[PDB]
Design a protein around this ligand. Structure first.
Ligand SMILES: *[C@@H]1O[C@H](CO)[C@@H](O)[C@H](O)[C@H]1NC(C)=O
Ligand SMILES: *[C@@H]1O[C@H](CO)[C@@H](O)[C@H](O)[C@H]1NC(C)=O
Ligand SMILES: *[C@@H]1O[C@H](CO)[C@@H](O)[C@H](O)[C@H]1NC(C)=O
Ligand SMILES: *[C@@H]1O[C@H](CO)[C@@H](O)[C@H](O)[C@H]1NC(C)=O
Ligand SMILES: *[C@@H]1O[C@H](CO)[C@@H](O)[C@H](O)[C@H]1NC(C)=O
Lengths: 49, 148, 39, 50, 98
């Protein structure tokens, strides 16, 4: 997911656009993965991740 | 292991056949039970980029450390038996050789202290080919081994 | 206690010979059905 | 003179797991893992509320 | 439906505990097989250590587990070593010549 953050794949921020409907047996997320573009967070987000 | 004879003909370090490779045979068995099979998949309960909550994070760290202390404790007990499980095979061959050598030559020995039998009759190379491969006649040479 | 595997065992006695010092089939290499009470 | 000897033997043993071996001829075993439930809530001796 | 995060922690803890008890399950058995071999061994030498003591100058050691009695022995003589009533002083003048 590179610069995408794994909770953005259901929101689609402007770096997750190549990723909105993926299909994988191995998801990979990076330190620079920002889940959002507009600043904020998901509530109860570790259950969601 | 080994076989060794020596005479007025020569000197030789040979092998004595009926167990000599068999130091593979329980030695092949230890290792895949030991290098065992792991099949349980473990998920991602905590996040290394940003901050699970402190109380459960303490419980997770306490549970992981507790689990860590269990698996690490279990780690160092598995090894100590395998060192023991190697000594016996030298022992169970040592008596095996000891129990073999006193049976094929009946009234033809006194027991040594060095692991060496003193053959109570004349023995050249054709006689060396009798006890080594289980073709010795311990009825035929006993009239002359009693006088020696 | 819950466990994953579905059978684990025990014994009473001897590894069996059909007719850690080497006594079961050693230089006494063999067995019986001669006596029938003990081993 | 010679007064010969040995010890017993029997004709069926069954598998086990060692540390260093799989499936020996050992006479018995019993399960250590129970599989067979009693498919009823056995509640003798306890006053019970279903 | 318990909540997912603790439910994950519960499942992870139960699985971790499951992996511990299941690991511990398979180590208990392997010694009991070993703990049966020794009893045949500790009787085998026991018999071996018994049979060379009650008949002193009356044997040579065999290879088959069978002693060759160095004197005459009928049924009343069979009732001496079997039940610890053998006189290993009385028959030794004639066992040296045999
Ligand atoms: C749990 O321990 C890790 C070390 O592995 C540490 O980095 C982390 O901050 C701890 N978490 C909490 C919530 O204290
Ligand atoms: C020794 O035993 C082998 C079989 O183990 C046999 O083939 C051979 O003829 C025997 N004698 C010699 C001199 O090798
Ligand atoms: C083996 O275990 C079974 C278990 O029911 C028992 O009945 C039997 O007496 C034991 N011994 C032999 C020699 O089968
Ligand atoms: C925990 O594992 C069980 C299987 O034993 C499963 O049915 C359940 O959905 C899991 N719970 C959560 C919260 O994932
Ligand atoms: C053998 O020993 C028993 C005691 O163990 C004794 O009562 C008996 O008289 C002895 N002799 C015979 C022939 O059984």
């Amino acid at each position: 997911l590179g610069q995408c953050g794994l909770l953005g794949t259901i929101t689609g921020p402007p770096q997750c656009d190549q990723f909105l409907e993926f299909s994988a047996d191995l998801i990979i997320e990076r330190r620079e993965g920002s889940d959002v573009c507009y600043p904020g967070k998901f509530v109860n987000e570790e259950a969601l991740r | 292991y080994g076989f060794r004879h020596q005479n007025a003909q020569g000197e030789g370090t040979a092998a004595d056949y009926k167990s000599t490779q068999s130091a593979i045979d329980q030695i092949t068995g230890k290792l895949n039970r030991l290098i065992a099979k792991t099949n349980q998949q473990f998920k991602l309960i905590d996040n290394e980029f940003n901050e699970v909550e402190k109380q459960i994070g303490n419980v997770i760290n306490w549970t992981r450390d507790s689990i860590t202390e269990v698996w690490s404790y279990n780690a160092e007990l598995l090894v100590a038996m395998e060192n023991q499980h190697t000594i016996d095979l030298a022992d169970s061959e040592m008596d095996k050789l000891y129990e073999r050598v006193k049976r094929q030559l009946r009234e033809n020995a006194e027991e040594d202290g060095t692991g060496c039998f003193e053959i109570f009759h004349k023995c050249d190379d054709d006689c060396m080919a009798s006890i080594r491969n289980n073709t010795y006649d311990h009825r035929k040479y006993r009239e002359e081994a009693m006088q020696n | 206690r819950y466990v994953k595997q579905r059978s684990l065992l025990l014994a009473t006695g001897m590894k069996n010979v059909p007719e850690l010092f080497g006594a079961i089939a050693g230089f006494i290499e063999n067995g019986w059905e001669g006596l029938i009470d003990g081993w | 003179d010679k007064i010969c000897l040995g010890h017993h033997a029997v004709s069926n043993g069954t598998k086990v797991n060692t540390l260093t071996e799989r499936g020996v001829e050992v006479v018995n075993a019993t399960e250590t893992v129970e599989r067979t439930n009693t498919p009823r809530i056995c509640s003798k001796g306890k006053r019970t509320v279903d």
